Amino acid sequence: GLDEEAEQKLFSEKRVELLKELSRKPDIYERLASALAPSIYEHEDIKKGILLQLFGGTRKDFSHTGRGKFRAEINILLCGDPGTSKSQLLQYVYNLVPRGQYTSGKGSSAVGLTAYVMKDPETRQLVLQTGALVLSDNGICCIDEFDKMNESTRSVLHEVMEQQTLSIAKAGIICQLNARTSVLAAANPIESQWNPKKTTIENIQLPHTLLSRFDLIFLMLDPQDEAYDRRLAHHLVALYYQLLDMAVLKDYIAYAHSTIMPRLSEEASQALIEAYVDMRKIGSSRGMVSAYPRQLESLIRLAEAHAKVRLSNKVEAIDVEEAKRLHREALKQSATDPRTG
DNA sequence: AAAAAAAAAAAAAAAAAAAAAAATTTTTTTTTTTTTTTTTTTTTTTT
Numbered sequence: 001g002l003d004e005e006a007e008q009k010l011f012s013e014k015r016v017e018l019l020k021e022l023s024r025k026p027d028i029y030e031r032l033a034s035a036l037a038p039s040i041y042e043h044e045d046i047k048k049g050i051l052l053q054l055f056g057g058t059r060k061d062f063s064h065t066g067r068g069k070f071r072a073e074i075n076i077l078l079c080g081d082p083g084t085s086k087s088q089l090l091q092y093v094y095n096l097v098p099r100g101q102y103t104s105g106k107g108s109s110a111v112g113l114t115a116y117v118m119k120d121p122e123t124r125q126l127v128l129q130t131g132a133l134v135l136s137d138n139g140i141c142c143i144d145e146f147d148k149m150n151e152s153t154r155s156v157l158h159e160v161m162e163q164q165t166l167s168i169a170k171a172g173i174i175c176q177l178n179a180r181t182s183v184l185a186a187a188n189p190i191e192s193q194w195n196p197k198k199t200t201i202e203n204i205q206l207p208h209t210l211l212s213r214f215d216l217i218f219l220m221l222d223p224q225d226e227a228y229d230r231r232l233a234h235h236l237v238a239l240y241y242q243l244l245d246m247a248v249l250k251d252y253i254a255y256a257h258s259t260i261m262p263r264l265s266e267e268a269s270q271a272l273i274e275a276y277v278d279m280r281k282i283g284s285s286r287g288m289v290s291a292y293p294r295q296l297e298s299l300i301r302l303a304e305a306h307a308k309v310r311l312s313n314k315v316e317a318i319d320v321e322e323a324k325r326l327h328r329e330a331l332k333q334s335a336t337d338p339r340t341g
Numbered sequence: 342a343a344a345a346a347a348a349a350a351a352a353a354a355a356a357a358a359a360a361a362a363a364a365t366t367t368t369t370t371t372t373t374t375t376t377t378t379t380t381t382t383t384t385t386t387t388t
Contacts, residue, residue: 119354126354151345 001098002138005254019255022248023311029322032252032309035244037092040085041235042228045329049076049216050093052305052326053140053182054253058262058315071164073182074301075213077146079204080220081193086186090142093184099139101132101181108132110153115168115177126172133160133179146187147205154210157183161213185214194221199287199340200331211289215298218330255311262307262315264300271320272299279324282333287340289331299323 004010011019022028033047040047057072078086094100103113113131120127133141133156143149143157159166164180190198190205200219204211211217264272276296283291302323307315328334 005258010258011251011255015251016255019248019252020311022252029306029309031244032249035246035249037089038243039239040088040092041232043085043089043220045326046078046089046218046220048326049074049218049330050089050184051309052302053093053184053216054097055256055305055308056182057301057304058308069164070297071162071180072301072304073164073180074215074305075161075183076185076216076218077206077211077214078184078186078218078220079189079194081189081222083222084220086220087144090144090184090186093140094142097140099136101136101139101141103132103141103143105145105148106150106153108149108153110156113153113156114166117170117172128173130177133157133181134166134177136181137179138181140182140184142184142186144186146185147190148188158209158213183214194219196341200336201287201289201340204289208290212292212294215295215301216327216330217289219332221332256308260308260311260313262304262313262319265314265316267317268303268315268320271317272296272303275299275320275324279327285338285340288333288336295327299327302326 022031025031029048029051030044032051033044036047036051037043053074053076056074059072060070062068062070078089080086090102094102111131113133115131115134116129117126118129119125146154156166160179160181161183164178166177166179168175168177187204187206189195189203194203201211204217276291276293276299279291279295279299283289283295299320303315303319306319306322307313310319312319
């Protein structure tokens with residue numbers, strides 16, 4: 001938790017040195033990703049995105065700039081029919097992270113996600129009560145069935161995912177709560193399956209603004225691969241007839257949050273500028289998910305997260321390259337083409 | 342056929358009128374009992 005991380009005397013010197021060694025290993029990113037969700041098979045890119053979400057970005061103070069808070073959290077959307085493990089991933093994140101809230105389909109409303117007023121049935125006084133997003137203030141909100149979610153409740157997430165605040169202006173009291181939550185959304189394709197006769201944007205069926213608010217989108221498409229099918233079948237049967245330890249995973253993440261505060265190096269800055277220009281060029285097509293300065297900030301956040309994963313404390317070219325590669329492989333820019341579909 | 346907007350339903354909280362509920366010993370009178378007294382009457386003593 002936040003309090004445990006804030007407390008200084010949390011790790012022994014031996015444990016700190018062990019964590020530093022693990023960060024000094026070459027494939028720590030792959031190791032942590034494989035550690036995540038051991039019961040779900042071969043979602044390497046998705047688990048890397050989840051790991052970067054857990055590590056978060058670099059919290060920055062922009063009060064002097066007069067610019068407004070900057071979201072350091074990583075928002076991830078998963079897209080795929082109800083045959084993939086998107087819901088399982090959301091459940092795993094919910095059961096893993098502290099301050100994890102869960103929502104699904106139409107089982108939520110705007111007031112029930114932000115705040116409301118109830119007569120305290122022990123003092124007979126009208127007290128204000130928080131919603132799921134506020135309850136997961138410094139944690140993660142996992143929103144399954146994000147497609148079957150009416151606009152009235154879906155529109156609240158704009159403020160949460162953009163400003164990390166929540167300005168409730170009702171009769172009694174008007175106040176700006178803080179919901180610095182990380183969104184892990186899961187949405188189904190139109191007609192509950194990814195038909196290969198439609199382009200990605202229409203298959204997703206989400207507003208451009210809502211999709212831009214996400215810094216990662218993973219299209220969990222289904223490749224008709226006999227090898228993949230056989231490996232998954234063996235995985236599941238072995239699961240029925242049944243590593244990197246969770247303890248050291250916790251210690252690594254807590255240490256990274258406590259100490260590592262990655263900053264931008266010159267090479268990383270130039271790489272990010274070039275990457276954003278190239279991303280705009282590639283995404284200026286018709287059916288592709290376009291790119292914006294929001295995507296530039298998404299790359300910045302992912303680079304900071306990778307720096308945290310490496311305990312670098314300095315964002316650099318390798319981090320930027322990993323951010324770009326992840327942001328492309330997720331959303332499968334390669335498999336697409338100017339003639340989107 | 343689905344999404345967005347409108348309207349309705351259900352439910353909870355607050356206010357006003359009207360019926361209900363709670364609190365509430367002291368003071369004066371007066372009757373009976375006892376005692377006191379004035380007169381009548383009866384008894385005893387004396388011549």
